[PDB]
Write a protein that binds this DNA or RNA. Structure first.
Ligand SMILES: [Mg+2]
Ligand SMILES: [Mg+2]
Ligand SMILES: [Mg+2]
Ligand SMILES: [Mg+2]
Ligand SMILES: [Mg+2]
Ligand SMILES: [Mg+2]
Ligand SMILES: [Mg+2]
Ligand SMILES: [Mg+2]
Ligand SMILES: [Mg+2]
Ligand SMILES: [Mg+2]
Ligand SMILES: [Mg+2]
Ligand SMILES: [Mg+2]
Ligand SMILES: [Mg+2]
Ligand SMILES: [Mg+2]
Ligand SMILES: [Mg+2]
Ligand SMILES: [Mg+2]
Ligand SMILES: [Mg+2]
Ligand SMILES: [Mg+2]
Ligand SMILES: [Mg+2]
Ligand SMILES: [Mg+2]
Ligand SMILES: [Mg+2]
Ligand SMILES: [Mg+2]
Ligand SMILES: [Mg+2]
Ligand SMILES: [Mg+2]
Ligand SMILES: [Mg+2]
Ligand SMILES: [Mg+2]
Ligand SMILES: [Mg+2]
Ligand SMILES: [Mg+2]
Ligand SMILES: [Mg+2]
Ligand SMILES: [Mg+2]
Ligand SMILES: [Mg+2]
Ligand SMILES: [Mg+2]
Ligand SMILES: [Mg+2]
Ligand SMILES: [Mg+2]
Ligand SMILES: [Mg+2]
Lengths: 147, 187, 105, 75
RNA sequence: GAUUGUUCACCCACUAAUAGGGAACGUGAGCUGGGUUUAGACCGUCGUGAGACAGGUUAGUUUUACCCUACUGAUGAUGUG
RNA sequence: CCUCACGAUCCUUCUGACCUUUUGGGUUUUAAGCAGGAGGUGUCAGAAAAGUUACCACAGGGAUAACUGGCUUGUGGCGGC
RNA sequence: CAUGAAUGGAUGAACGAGAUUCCCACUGUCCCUACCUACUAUCCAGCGAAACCACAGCCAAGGGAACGGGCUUGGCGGAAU
RNA sequence: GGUGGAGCCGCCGCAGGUGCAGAUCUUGGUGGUAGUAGCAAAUAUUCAAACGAGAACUUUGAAGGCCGAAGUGGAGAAGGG
RNA sequence: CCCGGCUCGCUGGCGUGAGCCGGGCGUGGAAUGGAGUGCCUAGUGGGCCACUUUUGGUAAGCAGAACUGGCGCUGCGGGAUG
RNA sequence: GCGAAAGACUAAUCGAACCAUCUAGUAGCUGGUUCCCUCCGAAGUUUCCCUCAGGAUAGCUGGCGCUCUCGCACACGCAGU
RNA sequence: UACCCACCCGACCCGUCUUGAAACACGGACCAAGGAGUCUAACACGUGCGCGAGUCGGGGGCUCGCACGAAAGCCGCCGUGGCGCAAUGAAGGUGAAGGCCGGCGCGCUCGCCGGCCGAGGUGGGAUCCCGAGGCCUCUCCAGUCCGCCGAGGGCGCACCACCGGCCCGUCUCGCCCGCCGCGCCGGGGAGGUGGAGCACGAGCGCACGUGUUAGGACCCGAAAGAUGGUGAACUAUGCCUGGG
RNA sequence: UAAGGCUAAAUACCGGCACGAGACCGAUAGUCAACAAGUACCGUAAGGGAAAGUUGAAAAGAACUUUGAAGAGAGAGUUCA
């Protein structure tokens, strides 16, 4: 609201919070980000390092859907499944290893972060990490690829 | 005719919750009482926390609450958080806990009760142990906010890595004069 | 004139925006103009699927939307001389006909 | 339009208003700046402290029981 | 008094003497406008040129007081029944 | 022998990896990257740049002259030992 | 310093509200002012503006943003015109 | 208290085109100046009567005067309506 | 600080050295005072004066530095006035 | 445009008309910037800049906090010494 | 206290730029009404609230002629999607775990097989726990209840300092490889170094404040530039026709 | 599958006809315009362009007497005023 604004408390104050030596003229610095090279260099160079200049390689008409690839960590794999299918395991005495279709929960890749519960699994994904391979293998379980 | 600097004689700390929620103002009325009376510094910290801001009493995940209760000796005590208990999907072996908090997210509420645990509020905690006897005070990581990354020396000063504010990160967004030794210099 | 660690902020107001600003106070009244049409059309064709003709099952193109399935534009021609429905007749029995779908599978 | 060209006039006041601070020094300062052949070695010294923990633990109980005997022989 | 826009200068002549200065380098709603110092022009020098020249030369609007004060005169004024 | 003898972005060129991209596959050119040098900004943290205005204009400036006034008194004048 | 030949040189009758110098005649330009006339101003009946105005309106000296009306110390101050 | 003649405020919350001495501010109003400057370009009016509430200024008569036919006289164009 | 012991791809005739683990021991000059640390951030970026030091200048209420103090930002008693 | 030429004249306007719009053109530059009380309280310096009437960054300032200490017979730390 | 008057002391006219204003600096005759930091978008931090590894919000949809409604409510829409949940490389691309033990390859600080623990350690660390010993209590002693003080000893959040470790880029150096193919194939190691990284999370949405911008942008202010138009009734010439 | 063609629906509407509403303005505000307003008026013309709302409830809007040339008064009357 206008009610709680410092512009109320600046009534009867001549300069209105802008100082009477150097008044609030219109545009003293420049207009916008203007003068990155000249006379604003200390800012752009000490707060935005790497602003000015080209780098890398042009890829004209990029489309994100080509390179779309979400990721899961093994940290939260048994979250994609209802936790009861995990409780209907570590039990059942048969080596059930329920199937987890990482594709169905919207992830085209499984990465190897975090601990994994000592439990057999079948993980269907598109692209695996190497360590995510070894974490599932070493727990006892398979890595199954899907197209 | 005295010659002290009155610069920083007034101490800037919160002595009342800046919020208006009557509930927080009520158990503040409770530990405005306990804190003055009982010798326990416990509630003097609990009181001095009930004032603080959301941004200053961060949420405590449930797993960080386990490994701080698993330590040798603090078995049988109660976890006490002036804050909220969140859930941790990346943890499953939930031991039985006795927790107190202002809030407990609904999911973490069912993980705790299902494990044969108990959750209290800061008024039953006043009746359990008014002195705070047999408790464990905890908190979430206050240097956890993503804000704390943009703080520090500066980005672009020598070997002081601090995240800069960029409208959107990418190839052509701040990898130039100052970042690659090939283009100007680098720090 | 920047000050002390903001963003770079290229905002697009240099051109002339004040003139061509489109406010949306029609928004709740348009919700109602459409609602009557939606109803007045259903009452006009009384026994008929109000939603419209039947559309076919169809898969989304790019690899990111691989696994979803949509309602397509219309049933293809190759589809139709399998079920035995003449292409001009189906347009009259609430079957969307798309004469433009290459069936590959 | 000539102007003053320099001065350190009340500068002593300014940078002594917050009271020039000798840099707060902790124990365990950073090893960055030490010659690599030191670290490239002392990291191997630190990495294999554990291989040889059995000697350390038993030899600790030896002096711990010899000085539990030294404090009991005084008693 | 002669010359000079001149201050300054030089001479003629007289005289007792032709001392030196200040007053916003006294004094433009007191004057004059000759000189500087707009616009017009003319030469010389300089500049490729527009033009420049404490280098000359001729032509070029000089407003307002009835207000307060000061001053000059002019009535008066309280007191003295 | 020590304290000076030098140069960003962009652009251009040269050099290096059996490098990467060159886009629906594949092979060759070609081009784009990556990493180092060079081509240069002497106003040397780096605009691509001649005048004149006495026909002039505007924003300002007593932060900046041309009068007066102050301080000073070399110089000028006047006067001592 | 720094003239000069169609960026024209040298002359020159007539002409010029062109620029100077001298002489005769003339004169209140002047020595040195005087009076006379008309219209004003002046007073009255009638009618009646404007620029301007922080507050205002007697001086010396002092200080002071280095020349005050006001401030300090003196001098002084008598209605309405 | 008064005049005035139809609506208005207290508290808890919300919203602003929200508080004026000033901008050579804008619009309107009003002073001081001041009953002051002024009603001075082309020589000139006077007597009697009439009318009238009222006559320096109208009208009639008488007298003195000026414009003096390149007019202050007699008719037109454009313009005015 | 003082002992005891482990580790090393460095260093070396052995030892150095550093790193670790384990024990053994408290006020180490006077005077003062609660300290530490992180976020946003306005105004400012014409200055002037005095003691002392001092550079141009003959000198300046001149130009230019040091050190502190003021004035600007601040009235009161005093210096008549400032 | 027109000029026997002065940058003259072009409807009180001319070194480049008047009218409406683009237009609230831009301004590192003048001017102004509206109620009280309470607490804290500066700078005119640093480096870079077509920088020298401006900015950028340093400082100096305030606000917001937090981490602890223990005058709760039972303190470490700092300092214009 | 406010009206008039009197006295003693004090006392220069305000606004402003300014090193310095009562200034022989500028604005201001007087009085009324008007009159200047706004809205939008985008960030940033602080703060409040909801939910919390999620959380929305829009557009749609389902419910009205609105009185209050162009509101409120509801929708596998609620996730199509944004932001977050993961980085790093120019890019092809890769992608956050280690410890320990036993067993097997020669433990070779190398490679493989079975079991255990799981985010490492050091120093401070608010601090809870345990507490030797005291301190009384009407007796000598006995003794369980209650606390106060409490040397000393333990766990140790948050955070800070440091040492380790892992991911990616690059380098160096060196070893063994796996084999749906052949190795100008792919794969692992040790050591250093670049990174806006991980090292059991903190975001999302909604408010409000402050600040910075883009916007006419706190209000007023140019000399100009551009696009279209209207003028020779003045005056500048030429022409036509009259007059002197 | 180009070099030929047709097409409803969601979509846009500061003009127009006809409506409805408002955390809007309330006569220097709100459109220039609450009224004979794009009117009066200015400019040759393109164009520019105002000011100005309120008696009472009902005109019951002051008959009559009187002073005055008349404007204006004094009484009276109307009115809740
Ligand atoms: Mg103030
Ligand atoms: Mg100002
Ligand atoms: Mg549909
Ligand atoms: Mg003079
Ligand atoms: Mg004079
Ligand atoms: Mg004069
Ligand atoms: Mg002359
Ligand atoms: Mg001339
Ligand atoms: Mg010649
Ligand atoms: Mg020449
Ligand atoms: Mg091809
Ligand atoms: Mg000239
Ligand atoms: Mg000329
Ligand atoms: Mg000056
Ligand atoms: Mg002088
Ligand atoms: Mg007179
Ligand atoms: Mg009424
Ligand atoms: Mg309003
Ligand atoms: Mg007002
Ligand atoms: Mg005559
Ligand atoms: Mg006639
Ligand atoms: Mg300044
Ligand atoms: Mg000076
Ligand atoms: Mg200025
Ligand atoms: Mg000055
Ligand atoms: Mg003066
Ligand atoms: Mg001025
Ligand atoms: Mg231009
Ligand atoms: Mg076609
Ligand atoms: Mg009106
Ligand atoms: Mg009114
Ligand atoms: Mg109006
Ligand atoms: Mg009225
Ligand atoms: Mg009225
Ligand atoms: Mg009345």
């Amino acid at each position: 609201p206008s009610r709680l604004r410092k512009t109320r408390k600046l009534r009867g104050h001549v300069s209105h919070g802008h100082g009477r030596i150097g008044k609030h003229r219109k545009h003293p610095g420049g207009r916008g980000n203007a003068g990155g090279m000249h006379h604003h260099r200390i800012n752009f160079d000490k707060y935005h390092p790497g602003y000015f200049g080209k780098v890398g390689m042009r890829h004209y008409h990029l489309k994100r859907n080509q390179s779309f690839c979400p990721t899961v960590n093994l940290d939260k794999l048994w979250t994609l499944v209802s936790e009861q299918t995990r409780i209907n395991a570590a039990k059942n005495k048969t080596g059930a290893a329920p199937i987890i279709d990482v594709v169905r929960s919207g992830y085209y890749k499984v990465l190897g972060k975090g601990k994994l519960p000592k439990q057999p699994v079948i993980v269907k994904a598109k692209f695996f990490s190497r360590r995510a391979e070894e974490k599932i293998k070493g727990v006892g379980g398979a890595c199954v690829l899907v197209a | 005719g005295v010659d002290i600097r009155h610069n920083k004689d007034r101490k800037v700390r919160r002595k009342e919750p800046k919020s208006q929620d009557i509930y927080l103002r009520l158990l503040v009325k409770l530990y405005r009482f306990l804190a003055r009376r009982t010798n326990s510094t416990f509630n003097q910290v609990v009181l001095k926390r009930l004032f603080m801001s959301r941004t200053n009493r961060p949420p405590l995940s449930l797993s960080r609450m386990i490994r701080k209760m698993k330590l040798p000796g603090r078995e049988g005590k109660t976890a006490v958080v002036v804050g909220t208990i969140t859930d941790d999907v990346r943890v499953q072996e939930v031991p039985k806990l006795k927790v107190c908090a202002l809030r407990v997210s609904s999911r973490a509420r069912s993980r705790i009760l299902k494990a044969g645990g108990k959750i209290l509020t800061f008024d039953q905690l006043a009746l359990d142990s008014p002195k705070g006897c047999g408790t464990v005070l905890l908190s979430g990581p206050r240097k956890g906010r993503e804000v704390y990354r943009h703080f520090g020396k500066a980005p672009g000063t020598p070997h002081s890595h601090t995240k800069p504010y960029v409208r959107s990160k990418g190839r052509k967004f701040e990898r130039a004069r100052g970042r690659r030794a090939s283009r100007g210099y680098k720090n | 004139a920047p000050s002390r660690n903001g963003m770079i902020l290229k905002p697009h107001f240099h051109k002339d925006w004040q003139r061509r600003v489109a406010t949306w106070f029609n928004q709740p009244a348009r919700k109602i103009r459409r609602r009557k049409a939606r109803q007045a059309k259903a009452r006009r064709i009384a026994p008929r699927p109000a939603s419209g003709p039947l559309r076919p099952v169809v898969r989304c193109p790019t690899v990111r939307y691989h696994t979803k399935v949509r309602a397509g534009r219309g049933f293809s021609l190759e589809e139709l001389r399998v079920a035995g429905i003449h292409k001009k007749v189906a347009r009259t029995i609430g079957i969307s006909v798309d004469p433009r779908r290459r069936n590959k599978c | 339009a000539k102007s003053k060209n320099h001065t350190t006039h009340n500068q002593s006041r300014k940078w002594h208003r917050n009271g020039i601070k000798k840099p707060r020094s902790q124990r365990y300062e950073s090893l960055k700046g030490v010659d690599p052949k030191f670290l490239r070695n002392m990291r191997f010294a630190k990495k294999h402290n554990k291989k040889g923990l059995k000697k350390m633990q038993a030899n600790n109980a030896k002096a711990m029981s010899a000085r539990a005997e030294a404090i009991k022989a005084l008693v």
